[PDB]
Structure formats: C-alpha cells, structure tokens
Design a protein around this ligand. Structure first.
Ligand code: BGC
Ligand code: CA
Length: 305
C-alpha cells in the first residue's frame, strides 16, 4: 500500500524526530511504501506535492500542514479521489475536519502542555527561593513564543501564566516575542533582551518549545547569565541533556513516538479500507487522537534517558 506523507519542514527539530519515527514504523511493516516529502515551510510547495502524491496512486495521505488554514484545500484534492487524509501535529479547523468523512487528526491537547509547564515552574520556583532576584514574591519572566496562530503556541503562551496564577504565583511579563519555533531566532531575541534595559530583572525564561529554549540557553551563557532557569516543551534528546546538566530547569515530553505510531496506524488502516482504529488501541474521539504530554525535570529524568 502506498502512503504519501508531507512534513511541513524537515529541519523543524521536533518534526524531524516524528519524521524519522514514521519512517522506522513504515520499514518494519513489509506491505507499506511511504513516500516522504519536505514541504519547506511553503503551503503551495505542499499543495503541489499532494497533487503528485495523488497522481502516484497513494491510498492514504498523512499531512502535516504548513498552514492550519489550508486544510480545506487539501481535503478537496483528496475527496475527488476518495482518498483518506490523517492531518497531524498542526490542527485543522473543526469545521474543516467535519467537512470530509475521511479526514482524521493526530495531535495533542495543546492546553495540557502549558498547564504542565506552569506546574513545573511553580514546583521549582517554590523550591528555589533565590530565583526571586528582586525578592518581591513575583516571577518576572520573558516568553519565547512559537508561530502566532499555531494552536500549540497560543495555548502554551496562555496556559503557562494561567496555571502559575492559579497556583498562587503572580507574574510580571518583561517581554514576549515570537522566535517561530527556531533556535537561531530565539538566540537573537534573548541576546537583545540581555542587551537591553531589563536584562537584570529577568528571572525566568519560558519558551514554547526546546529549540527556542536552547537558543536562549546560549545567549544566556554568552552573557554569563548561566544561572537563569529556562523551561521548554518537547523533551528532545538534546534538551534532556541540558535538563541533565541543569542548563534547563524542565521540559514537557511531546510524544513523538506515539503520535507517529498513531498517524501510521490510522493512515494504513484507512488506506486498506478498514476502520481508522481497527486492531489498535488508539482512542479516537470525534475523528481526533490526542496523545498526552508528560512533565520532565531532574527527578523523573531517568524515565526518558
Ligand atoms: O508544528 C510544529 C511544532 O509543533 C509543536 O507541537 C512542537 O512543540 C514544536 O517544536 C514543533 O515545531
Ligand atoms: Ca521577582
């Protein structure tokens, strides 16, 4: 069976571990041919790749959109040919999911990573009283946001502060800006914050993902401000190493392996005419499979590395 898969950007670091896990699953299954494509962060690039995949007779499509709003376009191309589409990681509109009977989504509940990240910061702030540099009881922080409009970026930006507040901890946002899920852009942005007027007031660096966290970690050691706690989201192998050295204070596992497994399992099922979850233990709720995030810090780190 031929399954065509598009990854919105191959050098997105979390999409790179998903991509690779998708490939290992496809190679262990002797009756499947996966046709992998890098959309290069361009939705028209992706749109033309879905035409070639359909021209090639694929039986199911697993699509990681560059734009969440291109879902309708992708469904209309798949529909003419009655082909299943499993959208994964960037969530389409509920109404776009509902417009096609064979459209499914594999993701996470975005909200939950922001809540867990807020609980990590609350636990380590209570425990590390010296992180309150100006001794006022409030967290003065900077936030590195992902793509504006992206469901994960927006929920993680909102729910980390809501959770801290809910856990009794008042916050003061010194600065927030997007570095668009990227290491080098977050390095620049942190360097700039550390070269500006409130470099001395920054107590906590909160980032919506690990690639950006790692960028802030190297702007922060360049200014020898290696003592500022940095939190991220995803539990990338490289970030677990920093959590281990203490250069980062915590992460949230974004489970690349089971989301890649669920995408593979539903796309092959649907490609073979079976029910989306047949023979699987995936719980599909309203065409959606949501995999859980897990909080990770020095105390439960041995479960991850
Ligand atoms: O859409 C891609 C993005 O999805 C998020 O869930 C991850 O945390 C990001 O690091 C990733 O780049
Ligand atoms: Ca403070």
């Amino acid at each position: 069976t031929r399954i065509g898969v598009t990854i919105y950007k191959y050098d997105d670091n979390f999409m790179s571990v998903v991509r690779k896990a998708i490939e290992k699953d496809g190679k262990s299954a002797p009756d499947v041919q996966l046709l992998m494509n890098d959309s290069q962060n361009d939705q028209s690039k992706q749109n033309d790749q879905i035409d070639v995949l359909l021209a090639k007779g694929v039986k199911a499509l697993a699509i990681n959109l560059v734009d969440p709003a291109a879902a309708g376009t992708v469904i209309e191309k798949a529909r003419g040919q009655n082909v299943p589409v499993v959208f994964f990681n960037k969530e389409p509109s509920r109404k776009a999911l509902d417009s096609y009977d064979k459209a499914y989504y594999v993701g996470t509940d975005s909200k939950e990573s922001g809540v867990i990240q807020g609980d990590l910061i609350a636990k380590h702030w209570q425990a590390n009283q010296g992180w309150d540099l100006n001794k006022d009881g409030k967290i003065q922080y900077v936030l590195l946001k992902g793509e504006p409009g992206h469901p994960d970026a927006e929920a993680r930006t909102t729910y980390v502060v809501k959770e801290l507040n809910d856990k009794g901890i008042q916050t003061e946002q010194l600065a927030l800006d997007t570095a668009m899920w990227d290491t080098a852009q977050a390095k620049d942005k942190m360097d700039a914050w550390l070269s500006g007027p409130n470099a001395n007031k920054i107590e906590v660096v909160i980032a919506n993902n690990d690639a950006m966290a790692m960028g802030a970690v190297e702007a922060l050691k360049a200014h020898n401000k290696s003592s500022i706690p940095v939190f991220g989201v995803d539990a990338l192998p490289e970030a677990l190493a920093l959590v281990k050295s203490g250069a980062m204070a915590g992460t949230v596992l974004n489970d690349a392996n089971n989301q890649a497994k669920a995408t593979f399992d539903l796309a092959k099922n649907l490609a073979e005419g079976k029910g989306a979850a047949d023979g699987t233990s995936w719980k599909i709720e309203n065409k959606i499979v949501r995999v859980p995030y897990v909080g990770v810090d020095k105390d439960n780190l041995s479960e991850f590395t």
